[PDB]
Amino acid sequence: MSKVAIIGAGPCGLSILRAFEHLEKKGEKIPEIVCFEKQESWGGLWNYNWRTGSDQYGDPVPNSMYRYLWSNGPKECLEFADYSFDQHFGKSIPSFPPREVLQDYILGRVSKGNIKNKIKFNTRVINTVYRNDKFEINYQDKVNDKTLSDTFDYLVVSTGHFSVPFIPEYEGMSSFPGRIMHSHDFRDAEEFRGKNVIVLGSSYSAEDVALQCNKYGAKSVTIGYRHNPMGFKWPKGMKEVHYLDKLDGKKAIFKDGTEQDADVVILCTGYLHHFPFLDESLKLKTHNRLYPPKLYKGVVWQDNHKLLYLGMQDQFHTFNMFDCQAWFARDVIMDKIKMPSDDEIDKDINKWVSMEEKLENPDQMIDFQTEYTKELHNISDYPKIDFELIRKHFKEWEHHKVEDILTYRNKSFSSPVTGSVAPVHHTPWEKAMDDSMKTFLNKR
Amino acid sequence: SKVAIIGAGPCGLSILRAFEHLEKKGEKIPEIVCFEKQESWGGLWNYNWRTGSDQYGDPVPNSMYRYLWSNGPKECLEFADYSFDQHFGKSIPSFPPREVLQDYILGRVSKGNIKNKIKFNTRVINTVYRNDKFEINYQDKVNDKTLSDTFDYLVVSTGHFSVPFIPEYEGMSSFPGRIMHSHDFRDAEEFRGKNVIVLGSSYSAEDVALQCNKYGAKSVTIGYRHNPMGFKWPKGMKEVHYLDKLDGKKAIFKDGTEQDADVVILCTGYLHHFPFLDESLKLKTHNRLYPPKLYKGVVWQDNHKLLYLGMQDQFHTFNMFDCQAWFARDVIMDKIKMPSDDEIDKDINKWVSMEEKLENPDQMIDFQTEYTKELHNISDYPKIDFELIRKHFKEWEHHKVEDILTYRNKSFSSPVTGSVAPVHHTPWEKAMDDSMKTFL
Ligand SMILES: Cc1cc2nc3c(=O)[nH]c(=O)nc-3n(C[C@H](O)[C@H](O)[C@H](O)COP(=O)(O)OP(=O)(O)OC[C@H]3O[C@@H](n4cnc5c(N)ncnc54)[C@H](O)[C@@H]3O)c2cc1C
Ligand SMILES: Cc1cc2nc3c(=O)[nH]c(=O)nc-3n(C[C@H](O)[C@H](O)[C@H](O)COP(=O)(O)OP(=O)(O)OC[C@H]3O[C@@H](n4cnc5c(N)ncnc54)[C@H](O)[C@@H]3O)c2cc1C
Numbered sequence: 001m002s003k004v005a006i007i008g009a010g011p012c013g014l015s016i017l018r019a020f021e022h023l024e025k026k027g028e029k030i031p032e033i034v035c036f037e038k039q040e041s042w043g044g045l046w047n048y049n050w051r052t053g054s055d056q057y058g059d060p061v062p063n064s065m066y067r068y069l070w071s072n073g074p075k076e077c078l079e080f081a082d083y084s085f086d087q088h089f090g091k092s093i094p095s096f097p098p099r100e101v102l103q104d105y106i107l108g109r110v111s112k113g114n115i116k117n118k119i120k121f122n123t124r125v126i127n128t129v130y131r132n133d134k135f136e137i138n139y140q141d142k143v144n145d146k147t148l149s150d151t152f153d154y155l156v157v158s159t160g161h162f163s164v165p166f167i168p169e170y171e172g173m174s175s176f177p178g179r180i181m182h183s184h185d186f187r188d189a190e191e192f193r194g195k196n197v198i199v200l201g202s203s204y205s206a207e208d209v210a211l212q213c214n215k216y217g218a219k220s221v222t223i224g225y226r227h228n229p230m231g232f233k234w235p236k237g238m239k240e241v242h243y244l245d246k247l248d249g250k251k252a253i254f255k256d257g258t259e260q261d262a263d264v265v266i267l268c269t270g271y272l273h274h275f276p277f278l279d280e281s282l283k284l285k286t287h288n289r290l291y292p293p294k295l296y297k298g299v300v301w302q303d304n305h306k307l308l309y310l311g312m313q314d315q316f317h318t319f320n321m322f323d324c325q326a327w328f329a330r331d332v333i334m335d336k337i338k339m340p341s342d343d344e345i346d347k348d349i350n351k352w353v354s355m356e357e358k359l360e361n362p363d364q365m366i367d368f369q370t371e372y373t374k375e376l377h378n379i380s381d382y383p384k385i386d387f388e389l390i391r392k393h394f395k396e397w398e399h400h401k402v403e404d405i406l407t408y409r410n411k412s413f414s415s416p417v418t419g420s421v422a423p424v425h426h427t428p429w430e431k432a433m434d435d436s437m438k439t440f441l442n443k444r
Numbered sequence: 445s446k447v448a449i450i451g452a453g454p455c456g457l458s459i460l461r462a463f464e465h466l467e468k469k470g471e472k473i474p475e476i477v478c479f480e481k482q483e484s485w486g487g488l489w490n491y492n493w494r495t496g497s498d499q500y501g502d503p504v505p506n507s508m509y510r511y512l513w514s515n516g517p518k519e520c521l522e523f524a525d526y527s528f529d530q531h532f533g534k535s536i537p538s539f540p541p542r543e544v545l546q547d548y549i550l551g552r553v554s555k556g557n558i559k560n561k562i563k564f565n566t567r568v569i570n571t572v573y574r575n576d577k578f579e580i581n582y583q584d585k586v587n588d589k590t591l592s593d594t595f596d597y598l599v600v601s602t603g604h605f606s607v608p609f610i611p612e613y614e615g616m617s618s619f620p621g622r623i624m625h626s627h628d629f630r631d632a633e634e635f636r637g638k639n640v641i642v643l644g645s646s647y648s649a650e651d652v653a654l655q656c657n658k659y660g661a662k663s664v665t666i667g668y669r670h671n672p673m674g675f676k677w678p679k680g681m682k683e684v685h686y687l688d689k690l691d692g693k694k695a696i697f698k699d700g701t702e703q704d705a706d707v708v709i710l711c712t713g714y715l716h717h718f719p720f721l722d723e724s725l726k727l728k729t730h731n732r733l734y735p736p737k738l739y740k741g742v743v744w745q746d747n748h749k750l751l752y753l754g755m756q757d758q759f760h761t762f763n764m765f766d767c768q769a770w771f772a773r774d775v776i777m778d779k780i781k782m783p784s785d786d787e788i789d790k791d792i793n794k795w796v797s798m799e800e801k802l803e804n805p806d807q808m809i810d811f812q813t814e815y816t817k818e819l820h821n822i823s824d825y826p827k828i829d830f831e832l833i834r835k836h837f838k839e840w841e842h843h844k845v846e847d848i849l850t851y852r853n854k855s856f857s858s859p860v861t862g863s864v865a866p867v868h869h870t871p872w873e874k875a876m877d878d879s880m881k882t883f884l
């Protein structure tokens with residue numbers, strides 16, 4: 001008889017709506033659920049949006065995906081246990097599909113029944129306090145420019161953590177005569193054809209953005225790193241150098257002495273966990289990491305067990321980890337899973353944080369998130385899926401990237417749900433200029 | 445008595461300055477706290493390379509770009525209590541680059557204890573009125589912490605040209621180039637050799653188009669929805685009717701025009717945006733010379749201790765903000781008494797009715813002149829010749845129609861000291877370096 005609020009209708013918010021649907025479909029009564037989504041439509045980061053900065057209502061644009069974006073990990077690692085690739089597509093498809101394809105898969109899982117009607121779109125949650133055993137929530141109806149209010153027994157935060165950019169300042173930016181942007185701003189790589197591009201950062205965004213710039217015709221691409229280089233086998237017109245010292249006109253100067261003509265600087269420097277719409281007492285504060293503290297099983301807010309965060313960990317696993325988290329959260333809301341004592345909660349949190357701090361390389365991290373996810377998987381209803389296969393897949397994928405960063409997307413992996421082997425795509429990724437679902441799925 | 449001011453741009457600084465005049469004379473003044481989300485005072489007059497949102501996730505309020513020059517005669521915006529002659533110590537041309545006017549603005553408030561009243565990197569986030577106090581929450585950005593305090597009076601001076609209005613046009617989802625708003629514009633060199641599309645029909649469209657051309661754009665094409673600006677555009681520039689869609693690197697207009705396009709710059713205006721005010725306190729309006737619900741254009745009709753500065757559309761700027769500020773100060777000080785609710789409503793209607801009838805720039809200049817002159821006579825802001833200013837604006841509009849490329853080369857006389865501006869050593873079209881250093 002509870003009333004449940006969900007903030008965000010991306011993969012995480014959809015995971016929990018889906019978790020609740022499984023129960024309703026079996027005949028179980030479920031709580032009233034309201035899901036707030038600031039975008040026009042569901043899909044979260046998987047929606048492409050030309051917009052940058054803030055929208056027509058002055059709401060910051062949560063979209064970070066760009067044109068020509070392809071799955072950066074094996075799709076088999078993110079398959080839904082309750083909704084297989086074979087079921088959705090009706091045939092086996094390659095392991096690294098373009099964004100539109102995976103978006104289609106995400107929305108397909110939830111588009112058959114009553115989930116969509118539970119979501120309020122163009123609606124931005126702006127304020128949350130907890131009082132008298134209820135979450136009092138203010139939200140903006142954007143189209144009408146109006147503040148609305150309601151009260152809930154449980155609150156699920158699924159707003160992701162890759163939308164609000166962290167944007168550091170370097171010397172000389174005030175006088176740089178080119179574009180300075182964050183990866184969050186990146187939209188169509190053709191913008192930089194024939195240009196000298198500087199990329200700053202050492203993770204997935206730096207890696208992929210650098211490659212897209214080169215692929216879509218940049219004159220040069222130079223990656224700066226602060227601590228250690230990615231060390232991948234970069235294409236001809238690409239180099240990796242240490243630490244940007246300053247910009248001096250159309251000239252980037254690095255600490256290792258490198259001087260590079262620069263037309264654009266793309267800061268691929270990460271994002272903030274940003275929750276301006278939550279009271280300070282409810283607000284998770286953390287940098288991007290595999291296991292932030294104060295989250296029992298990485299989900300339940302330690303100080304308020306009716307506040308549940310989804311997807312807030314750094315990610316190797318994605319979709320099916322979100323599912324495992326969501327099924328867990330559903331079961332907490334349903335009172336199927338009972339919270340242990342305060343001391344046992346704190347002890348369990350410390351166990352995972354301590355392991356997390358000790359992680360030293362991707363193999364250890366992959367093992368860590370595997371064990372985290374598998375433990376979640378065993379406490380609830382989420383269907384059979386082979387996390388051991390997934391563990392192996394991730395490690396193979398890391399090896400592929402080291403082997404050849406240009407060709408890792410051409411590899412084939414087997415489904416941890418159905419066993420199906422992905423066919424090799426008709427077009428090598430390094431030559432695949434058209435990112436449409438149509439050309440991917442059609443022959444030739 | 446305790447007063448909060450939100451924003452330390454020209455308007456917030458105008459009121460801090462108004463209160464300072466009194467304190468300097470020996471009058472006791474209220475405790476004043478001014479919140480500013482930027483690192484430093486100056487408002488829009490600060491250049492910031494950042495776009496979108498900052499390192500703390502706070503939307504960037506800066507909209508000015510590199511190579512920006514004053515777009516109206518500086519003699520129309522001179523401070524009555526701090527002349528250009530006083531500040532610069534010699535006559536200088538009428539259209540200075542941004543840094544020059546920024547230096548003038550901050551110079552007026554630099555000498556005293558005003559700066560110490562301002563909390564920087566501090567963003568007001570919530571405002572409610574209860575028990576006769578404004579309860580205000582603000583984020584200390586650097587520490588990522590929410591702080592709270594209570595005030596008797598609230599002055600909102602956060603401008604209205606920071607949060608962009610950004611309309612969608614068919615084809616944007618697949619356009620192979622940059623789509624941006626003028627609010628994003630930073631350095632025109634970014635577009636050298638590029639086919640630029642500019643959408644809009646006001647000051648941002650006009651100046652951005654010219655900046656792109658001046659800094660080597662291969663072409664510039666301006667789309668208008670209702671009416672063209674009609675200025676005498678430079679050789680490589682044209683003005684066409686209504687963008688229909690983008691189809692690849694192709695901009696297609698309703699009048700059939702097809703134009704090669706590498707970048708689309710939406711110069712489509714800004715929102716009055718106050719997420720940090722309770723719905724009951726929040727001004728809702730489009731850009732216009734006289735929004736309703738603002739007594740003398742300043743006092744919130746439904747709460748006479750909430751005062752908005754600078755929220756009108758602008759011909760006048762600095763010295764109008766001043767007149768509004770001196771007014772607001774005197775209201776806060778209880779020198780000026782509010783009239784009855786009915787006389788307030790009648791007075792607002794009087795000005796709104798006039799504002800709705802304005803038909804052309806001349807009538808608008810006359811309107812804002814009268815609005816400003818009336819404010820001027822209710823307080824003690826010093827002598828300044830608004831009649832001369834009225835004339836200057838009309839002359840400037842004429843200059844723009846005559847030649848949009850040369851209007852900044854014109855000279856105007858100070859309405860404060862009578863000083864005649866010298867013609868700058870370099871014509872605007874050829875003035876590439878916007879540094880105050882090289883200007884002076
Ligand atoms: C550029 C990029 C590429 C990526 N590529 C891959 C990939 O190839 N493979 C992979 O497995 N993972 C990828 N990821 C990881 C990605 O985070 C997850 O796949 C997934 O999108 C996370 O889903 P989520 O629901 O947790 O957050 P999101 O997908 O960000 O969804 C959050 C939703 O909440 C909404 N929201 C936010 N604030 C509010 C508010 N105040 N009120 C109402 N609604 C709000 C947002 O509009 C958004 O729709 C990528 C991430 C990024 C940024
Ligand atoms: C691109 C551009 C060019 C212009 N050029 C000219 C010109 O040449 N001549 C001319 O006369 N006028 C010009 N103007 C008009 C301009 O509005 C005024 O000159 C003046 O800047 C207005 O000052 P203001 O204090 O009212 O607003 P602003 O200058 O915008 O100051 C508002 C301040 O409030 C702060 N703020 C906002 N929200 C918050 C919050 N929640 N908490 C704390 N602080 C906050 C902002 O950081 C900002 O510093 C221009 C405007 C623009 C946009």
Ligand SMILES: NC(=O)c1ccc[n+]([C@@H]2O[C@H](COP(=O)([O-])OP(=O)(O)OC[C@H]3O[C@@H](n4cnc5c(N)ncnc54)[C@H](OP(=O)(O)O)[C@@H]3O)[C@@H](O)[C@H]2O)c1
Nearest residue numbers: 070071072168201202203204205208226227268269270288
């Ligand atoms: N499907 C795709 O192809 C694709 C493309 C983009 C993003 N993604 C996803 O988007 C999510 C986020 O990845 P991300 O790379 O953007 O974030 P991230 O993994 O959190 O990495 C942040 C990077 O910023 C660097 N950094 C921090 N401060 C810096 C500074 N002051 N100067 C320079 N560098 C700085 C960090 O390295 P240092 O501290 O050593 O400098 C780090 O490498 C991930 O899920 C990723 O998979 C996928």
Ligand SMILES: NC(=O)c1ccc[n+]([C@@H]2O[C@H](COP(=O)([O-])OP(=O)(O)OC[C@H]3O[C@@H](n4cnc5c(N)ncnc54)[C@H](OP(=O)(O)O)[C@@H]3O)[C@@H](O)[C@H]2O)c1
Nearest residue numbers: 513514515611644645646647648651669670711712713731
């Ligand atoms: N010193 C300088 O050189 C400098 C440079 C830039 C800005 N400024 C200042 O910035 C402030 C704002 O000027 P502004 O021009 O940005 O704002 P503005 O005066 O409010 O004008 C907004 C423009 O947007 C247009 N518009 C609205 N909706 C549109 C749509 N859907 N598609 C296309 N156009 C649309 C409007 O024309 P339609 O409705 O007819 O389309 C209008 O011309 C002013 O104070 C100005 O002085 C000064």
